[PDB]
């Protein structure tokens, strides 16, 4: 990457970044089949299988609760549009049409009555064990069975389900991310594939599943007999490898600081601005930005990087009366504003101070620095381009 400092304005510009723009949401509806547990009873007394059966029955009882708690949250940013999706799939019609679509195959595309298409996935392993292997030997209504191997298989097969309940119970129906028990690695792989974009975008998302899980989330539909229904909204990064640049600034004092700080990515030649820090997130030299939280700015805005006194675009630099000393760290360096008259020093991690800095603005690189210190507070240099 190239990072160049602007003596005027006391800002920086790190160019050479490559976009990964979240342009849409893919919807993956899951059916976690449990296998009609509550029809099985434990009359043998205390037993290991009886502990595991109560755990599963207590789990969906609590899951039926958490759905009930957040349906009552209806009074009347991408999640608020995502529960609207969850509204249409919660009906008994869609659930049945979804379960019917998955009777034959473990995964298929189901066309919703609302004119949309979601991916339907079936995780049957729990119900398959509860019906074929479990309910056969416990059919006596006595759980103190001889095969201890069955109780340990019960613990292994129901773990994914128990964790999903814990996941939805703690976050009250909507997780902040796609976890390993919401979707496995393989289930994630099939979903991103099914997305409507080309091979390059599929390749990058498959190489960066951790960003897919990060920006994706999940909503709980509810229990329908022995079927935990929940939807997972996966991000669709439909535009990649476009130019991006970050311009972070310190107050230059005589006193002004640059208000159009933050991330900028081009999409189809139209430059777009990401003011908030959580809109964009970086992995190496790639910038994952939220398209929805984006502001289309005119391309004349790159004039703030040659001379701000250019009346082709109002660069909207802001002014303050009381000068404030600050340090805004950039990815490939640091800009230190030291206008109040304090001791300001560049340092290293095993040599100590390298040079004392003057009163004002001065840009530093990691090539000849590792820290920057004012007073007793020290700022460790790093590539925190994810900082605003």
């Amino acid at each position, epitope marked *: 990457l190239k990072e160049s400092y602007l003596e005027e304005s006391c800002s920086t510009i790190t160019e050479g970044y490559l976009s990964v723009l979240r342009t849409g949401w893919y919807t993956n509806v899951f059916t976690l089949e449990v296998g009609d547990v509550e029809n099985l009873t434990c009359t043998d007394g205390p037993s290991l299988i009886k502990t595991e059966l109560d*755990l599963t029955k207590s789990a969906l009882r609590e899951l039926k609760t958490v759905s009930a708690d957040q349906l009552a949250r209806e009074e009347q940013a991408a999640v608020t549009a995502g529960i609207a999706i969850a509204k249409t799939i919660r009906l008994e019609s869609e659930v049945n049409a979804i379960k019917g679509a998955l009777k034959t195959t473990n995964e298929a595309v189901s066309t919703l009555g609302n004119g949309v298409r979601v991916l339907a996935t079936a995780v049957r392993e729990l119900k398959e064990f509860v019906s074929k292997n479990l309910t056969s030997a416990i059919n006596k209504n006595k759980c103190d069975i001889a095969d201890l191997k069955m109780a340990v298989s019960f613990s*292994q097969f129901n*773990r994914r389900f*128990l*964790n999903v309940v*814990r*996941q939805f119970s*703690d*976050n009250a129906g909507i*997780t*902040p*991310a796609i*976890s*390993l*028990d919401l979707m*496995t*690695d393989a289930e994630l792989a099939r979903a991103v594939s099914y997305m409507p974009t080309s091979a390059g975008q599929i390749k990058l998302m498959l190489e*960066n*599943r*951790a*960003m*897919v*899980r*990060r920006k994706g989330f999940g909503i709980l539909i509810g229990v329908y007999g022995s079927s935990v229904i929940y939807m997972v909204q996966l991000p669709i990064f439909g535009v990649i490898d476009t130019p991006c640049w970050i311009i972070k600034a310190a107050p230059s004092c005589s006193c002004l600081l640059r208000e159009d700080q933050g991330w900028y990515c081009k999409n189809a030649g139209s430059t777009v601005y990401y003011p908030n820090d959580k809109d964009c997130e970086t992995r190496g030299d790639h910038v994952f930005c939220d398209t929805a939280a984006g502001i289309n700015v005119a391309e004349q805005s790159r004039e703030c990087n040659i001379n701000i006194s250019t009346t082709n675009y109002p660069c909207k630099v802001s002014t303050g009366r009381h000068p404030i000393s600050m340090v805004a760290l950039s990815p490939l360096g640091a800009l230190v504003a030291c206008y109040k008259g304090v001791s300001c020093s560049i340092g290293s991690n095993r040599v100590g101070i390298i040079k004392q800095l003057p009163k004002g603005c001065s840009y530093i690189t990691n090539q000849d620095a590792d820290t920057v210190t004012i007073d007793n507070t020290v700022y460790q240099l*790093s590539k925190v381009e994810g900082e605003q």
Partner: antibody
Amino acid sequence: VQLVESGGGVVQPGRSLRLSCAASGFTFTTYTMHWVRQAPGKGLEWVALISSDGNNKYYADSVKGRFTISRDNSKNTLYLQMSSLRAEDTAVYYCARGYYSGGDAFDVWGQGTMVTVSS
Amino acid sequence: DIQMTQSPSTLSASVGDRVTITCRASQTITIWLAWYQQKPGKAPKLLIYDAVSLESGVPSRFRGSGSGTDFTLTISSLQPDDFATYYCQQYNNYPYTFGQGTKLEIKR
């Protein structure tokens, strides 16, 4: 289903040492591998990771520039080439397995081998 | 780096008690966290990955809870095995940082 570390011993400051980690019981070629070290008494400190294929290797700032992580999926072995060893690098070194693609929780660890860098 | 702050550093409790160790990250780490049980001279044993999900083999007395920056780990009924040192770990991004550790001592 186990990892076994080897190559630890006593060395002088500035010397070199190669740790190897033998993997067995799982599809080693699929998993992203790590080295995590723990000085005597102190807590845990991640040092390095290497991806399933090897294109992406990353190190902590402490060992950055001296240590080099590598792998050979043919022999199911994880490597760490330690150079410019200082006394701070005295620690037990475990190799650990990443849980899932992007989730680097360490679900399988090795016995650990003791490295002693003292003059 | 993301600084992981555990509390308390030392927790002294008896068999049968419930016990809550808290982890705190300097930045938001979503739900990417792990809790390890380390006994003297042995490798750490993973207990719960992500925020609340339990690893295979871990008893149900272990409970996770957390989102963003503030996470907890609660052992609902102390068994003599549970007394060790517990660590939290973020894996939001590298470098992967651990907590100071929490020593679960028995009270007398």
